[PDB]
Amino acid sequence: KLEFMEMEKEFEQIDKSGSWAAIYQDIRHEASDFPCRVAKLPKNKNRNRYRDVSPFDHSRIKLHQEDNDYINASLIKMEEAQRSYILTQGPLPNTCGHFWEMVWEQKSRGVVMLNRVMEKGSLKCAQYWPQKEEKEMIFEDTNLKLTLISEDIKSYYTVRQLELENLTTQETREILHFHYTTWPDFGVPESPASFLNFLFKVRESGSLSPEHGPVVVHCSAGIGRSGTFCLADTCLLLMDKRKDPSSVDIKKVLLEMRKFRMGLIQTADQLRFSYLAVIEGAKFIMG
């Protein structure tokens, strides 16, 4: 089955004819448009990192808390691939509590962070997890306690073991934190290999299994890097479940995803990268 020699030549083709921008732009202007009335209510202003990025009302995550149920987060549900993800923004100083509250209510087992607390000057994200085992964090508002249990730092990413405790029901759960540290805003990963490696680590940890709630994925705004990550994972699942990998149309898959959250994948290059990553990854799995 040198059927991959076709996908790869197809890639070199698009690459050759410099058609990536066209393909990407076409997707942008075909993407779904849905209302985001809740995100725009005056009371939720300070809960949004960015003015022009909001969760659609139909797929937004609702906090089971009584007061205000809003958080800038979206549930992406892929039927065929049979995987779900929650994409959200880098927590704000006033929303770290809400963030971990969502992780608890949705029963997530993993958190995937693709940005850095500080990016190109000025911290583009709050330090929502403990950096020192001995300095756990307590979130007054949502009444949760979080403790760093251990962490394995590597060259382009860090894996952390955390303990999240609901101080009301006195229950505790182990949350795995996968932080990819070398992915610039509006840029691509250091390399396809690093990316796939980080992704396989997330997969084998079982954090993506249907046993748990959906994995929480975020970057700064929760659309560029987060969209690339999920698009790649989902497309890899489809190439394995389809009797014919070539049948996977990444353009359609992204559009499908864009029905749940606006602007997933922010540059023609990220789209290209996700393609490269999917082919390399498939070749590896089907070995």
Binding site for ligand 213 (CB under 6 A): 50-53, 115, 185-186, 219-226, 262-263, 266
Of these, 47, 173, 263, 269, which contacts Cl ion (CB under 5 A)? 263
Alpha-carbon Rg for the chain in angstroms: 19
Least spacing, CB of residue 186 vs ligand 213, in Å: 5
Which residue lies nearer to ligand 213 by CB, 147 or 266? 266
Q: Answer yes or no: 235 catalytic.
A: no
Which element (helix H / strand E) includes 88?
strand 83-88
Angstrom distance (rounded) from CA 123 to CA 264: 22
* Distance in angstroms between the alpha carbons of the first and the last residue of the chain: 11
Which of 125, 219, 230, 235 is catalytic? The answer is 219
Least spacing, CB of residue 17 vs ligand 213, in Å: 26
Angstrom distance (rounded) from CA 146 to CA 62: 21
Least spacing, CB of residue 89 vs ligand 213, in Å: 8
Which residue lies nearer to ligand 213 by CB, 219 or 271? 219
Angstrom distance (rounded) from CA 261 to CA 227: 9
Q: Binding mask 178-197 vs Cl ion (x if CB under 5 A, - otherwise)?
A: --------------------
Q: Which two tokens stand for residue 161?
A: 């073991």
Residues 15-74 binding Cl ion (CB under 5 A) are 28
From Cl ion, ligand 213, none, interface partner of 219 (C-beta below 5 to 8 A by class)? ligand 213
> Which amino acid is residue 103, in one-letter code?
V
Region binding Cl ion by CB under 5 A among candidate stretches 107-115, 151-159, 230-238, 261-269: 261-269
Q: What 3-state class would DSSP assign to 249?
A: coil
**CA neighbours closer than 13 Å in the CB half-sphere of residue 106:** 29
Angstrom distance (rounded) from CA 156 to CA 149: 21
Which residues define the annotated binding site? 185, 219-225, 266
Interface positions with Cl ion (CB under 5 A): 28, 263
Q: Known catalytic residues?
A: 219
